[model samples]
Target chain A: GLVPRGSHMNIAIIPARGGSKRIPRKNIKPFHSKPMIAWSILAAKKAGCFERIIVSTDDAEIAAVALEYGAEVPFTRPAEIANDYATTGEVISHAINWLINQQGQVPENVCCLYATAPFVEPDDLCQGLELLTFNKECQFVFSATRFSFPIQRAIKLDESGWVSMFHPEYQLTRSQDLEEAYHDAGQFYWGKANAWLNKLPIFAVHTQVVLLPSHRVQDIDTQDDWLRAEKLFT
Target chain B: GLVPRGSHMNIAIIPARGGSKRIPRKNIKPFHSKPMIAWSILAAKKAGCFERIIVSTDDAEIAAVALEYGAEVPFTRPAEIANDYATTGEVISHAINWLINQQGQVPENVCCLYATAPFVEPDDLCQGLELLTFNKECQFVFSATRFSFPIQRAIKLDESGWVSMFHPEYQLTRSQDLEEAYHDAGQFYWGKANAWLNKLPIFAVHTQVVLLPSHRVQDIDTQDDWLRAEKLFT
Candidate 1:
């Protein structure tokens, strides 16, 4: 079952749901005339990050598009979980579970990610896994970036000339010196196989670093988000 | 110089500076057997945007790269304003000023973007600018996206399992209903030349919107950022 590159980490499940209204089939849509998802597909392939890079989607259109771009749509998302509110946990669990049932005991670790996450490179994911592997006590890891602007100085105005501190601690502090804040950059999340099965965020149980520069961290969802991402993609 | 076909409000800028840390001498950095920047050049031409598309840079090799891709590179970035601390505003101002002096007037509006922003497409910019023209009140526009986890509930953890709320308002409300926050998606900025130049920002002002669903955003500034973006761009 393993693709046999050091028999490395388990499979990579890319969950690209078919339901999109903001970008409207953006995953399958063209960026510079090439299929949009093709970028991610070719990336995972070229990096040889996973023995099995499986993309799970609900749309035949996306499936058709994925095939054209060299990704595997091993199975379509079930009608039930394909709804708008469907959680990523369920989708990932389903994929991993499906693979396990279809085959046998999977790898010791599983890496699942959002299909729309554009910040992940093969090396990033590989590094994430490597880091997780190096630290035996770690159960899971996700990519993140340090916030450039301090959260303390963040503003919320109520039409008054008075400017209150968004975070009181920032009132007397310099942004450069303020302790760095981190955000989940959504590059990749690798975890212990058993931890995910229990619906427990392996990252929660493990020591993790959310150390990413604010520049490359983005999580896409809406129409404007799509265009913004395209600018970065082209 | 507005094209009458819905006025083709697409304005693209190629921002390249004469600086190299890794791949020296030119824009072509061997991205999968081709010039890394070559993809952007041909893609931009095909995307069919840019009424007065041009490159803004201070390097001759960069200019050569622009020429190779059939782009215009006329002005060099001023040494006084070309330092690392220079803002995107300075570059945009210079480009717009150059165009205005040449034409004896400014275009109706312009979009200030990065040359390294290779992921942008013709249709996306066309539509983004169209939004500006359609809604005059949007005055100046830039792209951003909302954080999946409400920033209002940011926590600073202390010893012995203590957590202080970063944005306290989030403490009282449920995570689902708490107002979501968006970050600068790092894509593009569009505004009128006169409005921008006359303002303190030397740039127009406008309402802002942060994107959501968090998948469609990426800003490339470092080697790692470039690789991550390339992986997504694949």
Candidate 2:
């Protein structure tokens, strides 16, 4: 099936609901020098893969900010799916339904870019698309990084603050003897439109992880995290 | 069985040899504002718990620098335990043996502080001593931190560059659902004098983990790792 040159119609969706509790107005909060969401929007534009770059938001102010930053706000997200209880899958599915039902537009691929992910690079977006395009076994592709330490030898504190290993059997096991571990970088996720619409879990046997080096991975959920991210960015 | 104040005579044995493979002279390499090993020695000194803070080294230059940084280098590490093939346990054991045989001094505790650990905190050292002091069952207490992400959902790349999860069954599992995991921070290890002399594995069930926040943990093995560590340091 030979589609039009631009008809792959891959879309990049920046999910920016305005109800952040940890860091107030976090989606639009200034990161480095620009509004935080600007980085995601700019990276998507630079990747040059998306047919339509959209921002899914519940608040009018967030929609305006998205529009100002060269992203389309085709629809205001419903209140039900915008609350704290909503998962990322439901919010994205709403965008996909609106795109197909109201506008007669459906993308081949949909990428969910977290607004607070300032470290997201344009090249990673391209690589995500490449992974989804080239690997038939993969249903989703996303950014990830190796754990600095072997996870099998992890430890924890009890209710009484007494220390214990999660797996005491691994105490004698050398770190080199254990399998390497990695985690989701929480940057971007690339998936088939159908996968997003059906709410297929991102972490599955079919999902492919695009590995990023440990230094570049940053999870900015708190003020201290923001400071660390800024340091890493600089 | 309470010992007199400052009579515990806990010794801090820093294992620093001249033969670094990846980054040459990494022990003396300037990190942040001072030589990398200086941070560890200073932290040990500030903790005020150790009766003798000694640097076990084979090279004269390292001995000189360790001396300049206010750490005692009483005996040169033997060639048998100074080479690249030598394990950390052997190096610490050699120091422990020299102290017991030559000086007729047997400290109640011996702490092996890695020379490259710039983030070693004085408070953590004190806490480690406290853990070993109060917990009669614990033979060792060392610094550790939780993996930022769940280890169960780790990923790896094959020879063909295709991505696959190490434990595919954990693909759909939420990160929060997995048990918290940890690893040796590689900063400092506090243990009974006999634990080091007898080569008792620190990763055993009897050892206690002194938990450190993930942001405070960084292992400096490469240039990129050093740079990241410096960033985290600031």
Candidate 3:
């Protein structure tokens, strides 16, 4: 109606599933000194980046925490998506599509903020949105970071006393000479709401890489990832 | 004769006393799907920064949680340091000194990492030490971040229906035109091994701001802060 989420709006949608195995209840796991999910909710709201920050989780506790932190829990995710194996893309599409048609709203852009990554901030979010909206040339924005160390140097050993590279070219090439590698900033990914339905995967040529400061990219896939996040405070 | 922990050395110390108040057994409270203290312990050890991350808490639950995660418990903090009257500096300095002395080996730098501020990552820890060592011009380091909005626009309201700016320049200048601003990036501080002996609050000069993407700079010293941090991953 009115320029979709109004000319340009950053709506952060936190997708937290209830069931976790590797690290039991990992979605709501503690990070820093609080629940892990709060990072995305508070960052988006406090930074004023979002017209509305929505928590797309089936868990009541997650919704309560999100609302407590100022994120609007206008809708609860279907119970099916609450369990593991629910792809984040599917959940995000559900949330965004629902908000667009049923909720009487159209967010020009929808940001999928992660519960596990805490380093992404309002400034980053603002800059990221600016990349896509201001130019009008770009259609989507995603956060990315170069690893502190080269990942190609990794080794895999077989039953015998031999080692082989998981990624060979990376191992052979000099670290400095090799092209800089990137991983999803592992914090938040934002895109035009239409892009999800049209392209499915938000990243494409129009995708701009908002390079995060390296220290900000600790992905919390395991206990090691969580501790690595705290090591900085020492 | 030599450094106890080499460059790869990782050490973390958690200082919790038996004091009970706002959140009883604060160190033991369930946080992020686990015991509160586990967040700090797990994060540090997983970050793989310290040779050992130890919790110097007097409470057994804290100790158990510390152990449950990867943090070691070499000794319990003395009651004096745990008293409300004692400063955090005392607890960190004395505990670190005592632990090192107990092992009959003195380390180069004892990282006094806190369990309360949960967002600092191993990436930040590595950056902190790198900044401290790589640049000899700086003797110590502590993380910090820029304020979301300019302090130049801060206002002071009085009994009269008049508004005055705390910064005199606010009368003529625009908030957007102001230079960037920054603050302690939470409790994250790193220093010379001799900092404890100096005892001054000034930790470093030419200090490097980890530039923690604002989302992680939210520190906790009060009830409100506690609530804010908890919302991150809950």
Candidate 4:
């Protein structure tokens, strides 16, 4: 049976794959003054929850930057799990397995921090950890924010470019009448090491969330998104 | 029967009620270099689509700004519809009724533009007009944009602050596997005079859309939204 060696130990694993399609070298791209991945590393350090801060990347450059920013690169992430098709759950599972099988250590908790989350703060990470630690039934804790507009009033275009409601029942309902909706903030996911090792899905009933303000929750996937995040940061 | 006396004419009705609670006098608040309402007026003018551009406002200062920017203020918005509880459709209906009963000019189409839509462009308005004119079956043409994230994966918080998915079936679906979702851009809506008079719902299948890119679709509702709009404008 895998058991914690000493006191309850937590680890931070920042996944920074090299091959970014939309924004090249996105993992190491300079955001503000520091590399984009450095923000996650700094936040993890400031939270003071992680016993080990690690960067799992296939790119040597990203690894070097992570080390420079005071995160360990224990093993290079395999190309198999670093491609575009690779799921985040698979990458996290691989990291947890590596720490158990190769490093001879089993962490009590593992936090999978996104490298591109430039707006993440130490307080957010701390809140997420607190939620995970206190909630006995919660398997995962991640960041989320309310949708700027009501999702019930969403629409979509057909092949002929005509508009239709995604949920026609809510077409006539007032915005306040509809329930508030939220989406993943894409910042960090804290889970028990067993949950990550078992590859449990993160968006189910067993997971709780640290609510992030919409302003601080932009997904840095496109150039426009990057620009917006920079503006929000300033 | 209401028949047009002249060739098909289009009019731009900008509903800029002065009672903005979130940001005081938001309609006349300067955005970038000009008043916020000025952008919508300028775009309507440059589009060359309206026989008459009208700003329906209850406040004197907003009417003065609209007149300075070459928009007509034929009648003041009633106190009833100028409050926070009034619906946009009700306001637009009031304006259209005024134009028909008082002025005896029933324009074939009316473009209901918002006063706070600073990112709207002449091209977007023109595109909307083209869509409305060519599609005989279409009752409305409004601006829309894809949700930055897939809506199927959206979640909501319960009264006790627990997270749950709005659509639980799509919790495990890949982002690409789900159908793309869009929401109202909140910029401009071009409607047939009959549709506006009948108070037909705008989010129905009879409507078409001019798809604005996500970068140009920011809602100026709160102080944070105002800051983001200014940042996007620059």
Instruction: Give a tens-digit lDDT track for model 4, residues A1-234.
Output: 233456687888898787788999998888887899999999899998778989988888899999999999998875644335567777888888888899778777889999988778889888888889898878899988888878888888889888888888986687679988888888899999888878777876588889887667776888877876777687
Report per-candidate TM-score of chain A alone.
0.84, 0.92, 0.83, 0.91
Q: Give the lDDT ranking, best first.
A: 4, 2, 3, 1
Q: What is each predicted model's overall lDDT from 0 to 1?
A: 0.60, 0.81, 0.62, 0.84
Better of 2 and 3 by DockQ: 2
DockQ-based ranking: 4, 2, 1, 3
Per-residue lDDT over B117-192 for candidate 4, one digit per residue giving the tens place of the 0 to 100 score: 8778888898888899898988999988888878888888777567788888887677778988888888889999
Give the local distance difference test score of model 1.
Answer: 0.60
lDDT tens digits by residue: candidate 2, A11-61: 988887776779998988888877889888988888888878899888787
lDDT measured at residue A150 in model 3 versus the true structure, 0 to 100:
39
What docking grade does candidate 4 earn?
A: medium
Question: TM-score of each candidate?
Answer: 0.53, 0.91, 0.47, 0.91
TM-score of chain A of 1: 0.84
Q: Residue-wise lDDT of candidate 1 within B1-234, one digit each (tens)?
A: 446754534455666665565545335565545555665555556756567667777766667777877876767665433246455666777777776787554566767655554555545555556666676665555554445545564555334222244555544566678543444455566666655565433111344332323444554545676666667666
Superior by lDDT: candidate 2 or candidate 3: 2
- What ranges in model 3 sit over 4 Å off? A1-6, A81-84, A151-154, A166-174, A224-228, A231-234, B1-234
Give the Cα error of residue A184 in candidate 1, in Å. 0.9
TM-score between model 4 and native: 0.91
**Which should have the higher DockQ, number 1 or number 4?**
4
Per-prediction DockQ scores?
Answer: 0.05, 0.47, 0.02, 0.64
List model 3 lDDT by residue over B103-198, tens digit each. Answer: 754444456667666776767876776666676644456665554434444433234212333455554565567655455554456665566545
Q: Once superposed on the true structure, which residue ranges of model 2 sit more than 4 Å away at CA? A: A1-6, A81-84, A160-164, A167-175, B1-6, B80-84, B156-176
User: Which DockQ-derived CAPRI band holds candidate 3?
Assistant: incorrect
